[PDB]
């Protein structure tokens, strides 16, 4: 019945007291957090409260679109020794920090992912060379599907792979993907091992990395420049902005205190000092 945009509990007028009631007294040993409102420890006037928790609702908290990855590609000359660089990226929020930390306050979740692609470009050589408006392809290769080998192989024919042809200089590309989780909720943390070391086997064959799983495996993105080789090398960056929408979460955890190090819960040394100096008896 209570929604987000509802007014918080109205403060009630309270006066002098001398009773067998003990609001102020608790014992945090019970695990229970003592619920004390204003009209308890002090005499408060009647206040028709107006503040609402609207903007603090789960949906609202993650209501921004974060930068998950930067993918580099180019379009080098037909005469270059190197191959036309096409980008491949493992789909994950973890690569950066921000979006990750926010997703860390909870143990689990369900959310339809909405993606954004703000592509940029530029020349590289000190040549007054020309380049026509470039076309971009964003290709979603699910787990175990043909990942491209060249910038021009049968794979990009994508008879079944959902791709996005972006024409540079237009309103950024966008797609929506629902809950593709193999579970019931995507596990931001996972206490375990994909394999179980066995006894009539060898340490090699039953060794697995702690913390990982297939849960957080969804596929990779492959981006290229659909235009062929051009007389002037034109590099390009693909920024991916992800925004969780229609979100739910389960069981809170404390936010990441120290600086990140890897996709694991691991921490590097020298970054173990989160706080600063401040006296106990000084304001």
């Amino acid at each position, epitope marked *: 019945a209570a929604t987000s945009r509802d007014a918080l509990p109205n403060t009630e007028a309270s006066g002098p007291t001398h009773s067998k009631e003990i609001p102020a007294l608790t014992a945090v040993e019970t695990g229970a957090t003592n619920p004390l409102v204003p009209s308890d420890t002090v005499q408060t006037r009647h206040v028709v409260q107006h503040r609402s928790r609207s903007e603090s609702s789960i949906e609202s908290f993650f209501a921004r679109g974060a930068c998950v*990855t930067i*993918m*580099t590609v180019d379009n080098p000359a037909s005469t270059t020794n190197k*191959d036309k*660089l*096409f*980008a*491949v*990226w*493992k789909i994950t929020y973890k690569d950066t920090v921000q979006l990750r930390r926010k997703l860390e306050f909870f143990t689990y979740s369900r959310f339809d992912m909405e993606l954004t692609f703000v592509v940029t470009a530029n020349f590289t050589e000190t040549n007054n060379g020309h380049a026509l408006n470039q076309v971009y392809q964003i290709m979603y290769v699910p*787990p*175990g599907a043909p*990942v491209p*080998e060249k910038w021009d192989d049968y794979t990009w024919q994508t008879s079944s792979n959902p791709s996005i042809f972006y024409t540079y200089g237009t309103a950024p590309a966008r797609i929506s993907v629902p809950y593709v989780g193999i579970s019931n909720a995507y596990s931001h943390f996972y206490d375990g*091992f*994909s*394999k179980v070391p066995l006894k009539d086997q*060898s340490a*090699a*064959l039953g*060794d*697995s*990395l702690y913390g*990982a*799983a*297939s849960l957080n*495996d969804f596929g*990779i993105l492959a981006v290229r420049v659909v235009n062929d080789h051009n007389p002037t090398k034109v590099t390009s960056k693909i920024r991916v902005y992800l925004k969780p929408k229609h979100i739910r979460v389960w069981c809170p955890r404390p936010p990441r205190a120290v600086a990140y*190090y*890897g*996709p*694991g819960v*691991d921490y*590097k040394d020298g970054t173990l000092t989160p706080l600063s100096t401040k006296d106990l008896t000084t304001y």
Partner: nanobody
Amino acid sequence: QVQLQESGGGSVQAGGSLTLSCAASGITYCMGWYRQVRGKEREGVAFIKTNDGTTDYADSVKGRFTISQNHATKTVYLQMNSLKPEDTAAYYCAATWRWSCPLDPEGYQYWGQGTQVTVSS
């Protein structure tokens, strides 16, 4: 489009141990499946999955080598122990996202420059 680099390789005696480092460009493990293929020419040693576990070693080296993943630095190593003269080979590192093909040298797409290791008798 990752770029490999073979570092931490050199001369040592017989019986000892040496470590090999393989840092990579990107967006590294994103091309997935890192490997260690020795031989003066071409022959595998270690194979590894960027996700999950997921080790496996060449029968010829089994139980003396280990390939590890440092996703933070983007470096894949290779701890070679109890070295023996037959270990003096041309070491390299590899990758292909294709979650399979670890038994074919020509199945790859990525290769580094290399580092000669010498197990001096």
